[PDB]
PDB file of C-alpha atoms and ligand atoms in Angstrom:
ATOM      1  CA  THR I 384       0.000   0.000   0.000  1.00  0.00           C
ATOM      2  CA  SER I 385       2.471   2.615  -1.252  1.00  0.00           C
ATOM      3  CA  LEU I 386       2.354   5.011  -4.218  1.00  0.00           C
ATOM      4  CA  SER I 387       5.399   6.878  -5.521  1.00  0.00           C
ATOM      5  CA  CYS I 388       6.460   9.577  -7.981  1.00  0.00           C
ATOM      6  CA  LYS I 389       6.654   7.991 -11.441  1.00  0.00           C
ATOM      7  CA  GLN I 390       9.620  10.081 -12.582  1.00  0.00           C
ATOM      8  CA  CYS I 391      12.010   9.965  -9.599  1.00  0.00           C
ATOM      9  CA  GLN I 392      10.421   6.759  -8.277  1.00  0.00           C
ATOM     10  CA  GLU I 393      11.986   6.790  -4.788  1.00  0.00           C
ATOM     11  CA  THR I 394       9.531   9.246  -3.223  1.00  0.00           C
ATOM     12  CA  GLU I 395       6.413   8.029  -1.393  1.00  0.00           C
ATOM     13  CA  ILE I 396       3.517  10.435  -1.993  1.00  0.00           C
ATOM     14  CA  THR I 397       0.620   8.522  -0.412  1.00  0.00           C
ATOM     15  CA  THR I 398      -0.690   5.054   0.486  1.00  0.00           C
ATOM     16  CA  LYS I 399      -3.636   3.144  -1.000  1.00  0.00           C
ATOM     17  CA  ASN I 400      -5.576   3.228   2.295  1.00  0.00           C
ATOM     18  CA  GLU I 401      -5.761   7.034   2.020  1.00  0.00           C
ATOM     19  CA  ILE I 402      -8.049   6.738  -1.029  1.00  0.00           C
ATOM     20  CA  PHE I 403     -11.678   7.869  -0.818  1.00  0.00           C
ATOM     21  CA  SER I 404     -14.603   8.527  -3.168  1.00  0.00           C
ATOM     22  CA  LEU I 405     -15.645  12.175  -3.534  1.00  0.00           C
ATOM     23  CA  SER I 406     -16.894  11.701  -7.083  1.00  0.00           C
ATOM     24  CA  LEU I 407     -19.315   9.449  -5.151  1.00  0.00           C
ATOM     25  CA  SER I 408     -19.308   7.592  -8.467  1.00  0.00           C
ATOM     26  CA  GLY I 409     -15.808   6.335  -7.612  1.00  0.00           C
ATOM     27  CA  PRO I 410     -12.460   7.542  -6.171  1.00  0.00           C
ATOM     28  CA  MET I 411     -11.202   7.600  -9.771  1.00  0.00           C
ATOM     29  CA  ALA I 412     -12.776  10.231 -12.033  1.00  0.00           C
ATOM     30  CA  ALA I 413     -11.855  12.189 -15.155  1.00  0.00           C
ATOM     31  CA  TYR I 414     -12.134  15.981 -15.358  1.00  0.00           C
ATOM     32  CA  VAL I 415     -11.663  18.457 -18.200  1.00  0.00           C
ATOM     33  CA  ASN I 416      -9.559  21.601 -17.724  1.00  0.00           C
ATOM     34  CA  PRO I 417     -10.466  24.971 -19.372  1.00  0.00           C
ATOM     35  CA  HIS I 418      -8.462  24.218 -22.537  1.00  0.00           C
ATOM     36  CA  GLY I 419     -10.346  20.932 -23.030  1.00  0.00           C
ATOM     37  CA  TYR I 420      -7.600  18.503 -21.943  1.00  0.00           C
ATOM     38  CA  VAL I 421      -8.798  15.523 -19.897  1.00  0.00           C
ATOM     39  CA  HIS I 422      -7.159  14.654 -16.564  1.00  0.00           C
ATOM     40  CA  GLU I 423      -7.759  11.259 -14.926  1.00  0.00           C
ATOM     41  CA  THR I 424      -7.561  11.869 -11.179  1.00  0.00           C
ATOM     42  CA  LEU I 425      -7.570  10.053  -7.830  1.00  0.00           C
ATOM     43  CA  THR I 426      -8.920  11.656  -4.638  1.00  0.00           C
ATOM     44  CA  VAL I 427      -6.935  10.937  -1.450  1.00  0.00           C
ATOM     45  CA  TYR I 428      -7.214  12.347   2.084  1.00  0.00           C
ATOM     46  CA  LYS I 429      -3.498  12.816   2.758  1.00  0.00           C
ATOM     47  CA  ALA I 430      -0.271  13.173   0.780  1.00  0.00           C
ATOM     48  CA  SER I 431       3.268  14.361   1.554  1.00  0.00           C
ATOM     49  CA  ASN I 432       6.578  15.203  -0.156  1.00  0.00           C
ATOM     50  CA  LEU I 433       4.750  17.898  -2.133  1.00  0.00           C
ATOM     51  CA  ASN I 434       5.692  21.533  -2.671  1.00  0.00           C
ATOM     52  CA  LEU I 435       2.604  23.685  -3.239  1.00  0.00           C
ATOM     53  CA  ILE I 436       2.801  26.539  -5.735  1.00  0.00           C
ATOM     54  CA  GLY I 437       0.562  29.595  -6.204  1.00  0.00           C
ATOM     55  CA  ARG I 438      -2.522  30.779  -4.311  1.00  0.00           C
ATOM     56  CA  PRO I 439      -5.658  28.614  -4.023  1.00  0.00           C
ATOM     57  CA  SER I 440      -7.991  29.354  -6.953  1.00  0.00           C
ATOM     58  CA  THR I 441     -11.612  28.382  -7.653  1.00  0.00           C
ATOM     59  CA  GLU I 442     -11.433  29.139 -11.395  1.00  0.00           C
ATOM     60  CA  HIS I 443     -13.089  26.115 -13.023  1.00  0.00           C
ATOM     61  CA  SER I 444     -12.852  24.015  -9.854  1.00  0.00           C
ATOM     62  CA  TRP I 445     -13.734  20.342 -10.343  1.00  0.00           C
ATOM     63  CA  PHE I 446     -15.146  20.130  -6.807  1.00  0.00           C
ATOM     64  CA  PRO I 447     -17.478  23.140  -6.244  1.00  0.00           C
ATOM     65  CA  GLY I 448     -16.915  24.465  -2.724  1.00  0.00           C
ATOM     66  CA  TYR I 449     -13.157  23.832  -2.934  1.00  0.00           C
ATOM     67  CA  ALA I 450     -10.177  25.788  -4.267  1.00  0.00           C
ATOM     68  CA  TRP I 451      -7.181  24.160  -5.963  1.00  0.00           C
ATOM     69  CA  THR I 452      -3.443  24.729  -5.536  1.00  0.00           C
ATOM     70  CA  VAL I 453      -0.926  23.064  -7.870  1.00  0.00           C
ATOM     71  CA  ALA I 454       1.258  20.331  -6.342  1.00  0.00           C
ATOM     72  CA  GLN I 455       4.697  19.045  -7.386  1.00  0.00           C
ATOM     73  CA  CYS I 456       7.220  16.437  -6.253  1.00  0.00           C
ATOM     74  CA  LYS I 457       9.703  17.748  -3.671  1.00  0.00           C
ATOM     75  CA  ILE I 458      12.537  15.988  -5.471  1.00  0.00           C
ATOM     76  CA  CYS I 459      12.027  16.182  -9.241  1.00  0.00           C
ATOM     77  CA  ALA I 460       9.432  19.001  -9.484  1.00  0.00           C
ATOM     78  CA  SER I 461       7.177  16.689 -11.508  1.00  0.00           C
ATOM     79  CA  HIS I 462       3.530  17.813 -11.485  1.00  0.00           C
ATOM     80  CA  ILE I 463       1.647  15.249  -9.384  1.00  0.00           C
ATOM     81  CA  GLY I 464      -1.743  16.921  -8.930  1.00  0.00           C
ATOM     82  CA  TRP I 465      -3.657  19.631  -7.066  1.00  0.00           C
ATOM     83  CA  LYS I 466      -4.557  20.218  -3.413  1.00  0.00           C
ATOM     84  CA  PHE I 467      -8.189  21.092  -2.664  1.00  0.00           C
ATOM     85  CA  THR I 468      -9.144  23.376   0.234  1.00  0.00           C
ATOM     86  CA  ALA I 469     -12.664  24.220   1.443  1.00  0.00           C
ATOM     87  CA  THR I 470     -13.871  27.830   1.251  1.00  0.00           C
ATOM     88  CA  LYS I 471     -16.100  27.590   4.357  1.00  0.00           C
ATOM     89  CA  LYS I 472     -15.905  25.930   7.786  1.00  0.00           C
ATOM     90  CA  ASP I 473     -19.001  23.739   7.395  1.00  0.00           C
ATOM     91  CA  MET I 474     -17.696  21.500   4.578  1.00  0.00           C
ATOM     92  CA  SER I 475     -16.146  18.059   5.102  1.00  0.00           C
ATOM     93  CA  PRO I 476     -13.478  17.093   4.361  1.00  0.00           C
ATOM     94  CA  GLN I 477     -11.797  20.500   4.701  1.00  0.00           C
ATOM     95  CA  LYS I 478      -8.821  19.476   2.549  1.00  0.00           C
ATOM     96  CA  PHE I 479      -7.868  16.591   0.245  1.00  0.00           C
ATOM     97  CA  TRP I 480      -5.747  15.911  -2.857  1.00  0.00           C
ATOM     98  CA  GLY I 481      -6.549  15.150  -6.507  1.00  0.00           C
ATOM     99  CA  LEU I 482      -3.625  13.297  -8.097  1.00  0.00           C
ATOM    100  CA  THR I 483      -2.870  12.396 -11.719  1.00  0.00           C
ATOM    101  CA  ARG I 484      -2.950   8.585 -11.872  1.00  0.00           C
ATOM    102  CA  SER I 485      -0.431   8.554 -14.735  1.00  0.00           C
ATOM    103  CA  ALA I 486       1.997  10.395 -12.422  1.00  0.00           C
ATOM    104  CA  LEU I 487       2.236   7.644  -9.781  1.00  0.00           C
ATOM    105  CA  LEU I 488       3.533   4.087  -9.333  1.00  0.00           C
ATOM    106  CA  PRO I 489       2.041   1.615  -9.652  1.00  0.00           C
ATOM    107  CA  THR I 490      -0.440   3.242 -12.041  1.00  0.00           C
ATOM    108  CA  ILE I 491      -3.983   1.999 -11.379  1.00  0.00           C
TER     109      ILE I 491
HETATM  110  O1  LIG A 927     -10.165  21.798  -9.981  1.00  0.00           O
HETATM  111  C1  LIG A 927      -9.364  21.980 -10.883  1.00  0.00           C
HETATM  112  C2  LIG A 927      -7.944  21.535 -10.779  1.00  0.00           C
HETATM  113  C3  LIG A 927      -6.988  21.930 -11.890  1.00  0.00           C
HETATM  114  N1  LIG A 927      -7.651  22.467 -13.087  1.00  0.00           N
HETATM  115  C4  LIG A 927      -6.809  22.715 -14.148  1.00  0.00           C
HETATM  116  C5  LIG A 927      -5.835  21.917 -14.752  1.00  0.00           C
HETATM  117  N2  LIG A 927      -5.109  22.570 -15.731  1.00  0.00           N
HETATM  118  C6  LIG A 927      -5.554  23.856 -15.665  1.00  0.00           C
HETATM  119  C7  LIG A 927      -5.173  25.054 -16.400  1.00  0.00           C
HETATM  120  C8  LIG A 927      -5.788  26.228 -16.140  1.00  0.00           C
HETATM  121  C9  LIG A 927      -6.815  26.305 -15.117  1.00  0.00           C
HETATM  122  C10 LIG A 927      -7.156  25.188 -14.435  1.00  0.00           C
HETATM  123  N3  LIG A 927      -6.539  23.979 -14.696  1.00  0.00           N
HETATM  124  C11 LIG A 927      -5.194  27.298 -17.044  1.00  0.00           C
HETATM  125  C12 LIG A 927      -6.264  28.037 -17.859  1.00  0.00           C
HETATM  126  C13 LIG A 927      -5.679  29.182 -18.658  1.00  0.00           C
HETATM  127  N4  LIG A 927      -4.971  30.133 -17.794  1.00  0.00           N
HETATM  128  C14 LIG A 927      -3.889  29.470 -17.055  1.00  0.00           C
HETATM  129  C15 LIG A 927      -4.410  28.323 -16.213  1.00  0.00           C
HETATM  130  C16 LIG A 927      -4.245  26.441 -17.920  1.00  0.00           C
HETATM  131  O2  LIG A 927      -4.238  25.090 -17.368  1.00  0.00           O
HETATM  132  C17 LIG A 927      -8.961  22.844 -13.118  1.00  0.00           C
HETATM  133  O3  LIG A 927      -9.435  23.365 -14.118  1.00  0.00           O
HETATM  134  N5  LIG A 927      -9.743  22.583 -12.016  1.00  0.00           N
HETATM  135 ZN1  LIG A 928       9.742  12.990  -8.111  1.00  0.00          ZN
END
């Protein structure tokens, strides 16, 4: 139960027992960005070895209620996913992560 950066390979990002379904039609979804490109994601509660980058934004957020910040590998600066943060106190969970499945190992 261990998932790692695909590019540098050594770095543990998260474990499989951190996965959860917030699509509610699965933990694994696919979302389209503004330019029309499709990203196949995986929602997890917790992840580490990630440098965040930029302010949280809600421009075209895939989870309404939440804002997204870009996330990268500490080591190789490879784009892993985004971190989602709630915009009010009442929501739950308050924060989680949406990771690119094709950026992790093993890919599932
Ligand atoms: O919830 C999410 C998570 C990530 N994204 C996302 C992934 N790639 C982009 C992206 C932009 C905005 C959002 N995203 C652009 C649009 C044009 N101006 C620069 C930013 C270019 O690439 C979301 O759209 N929603
Ligand atoms: Zn890496």
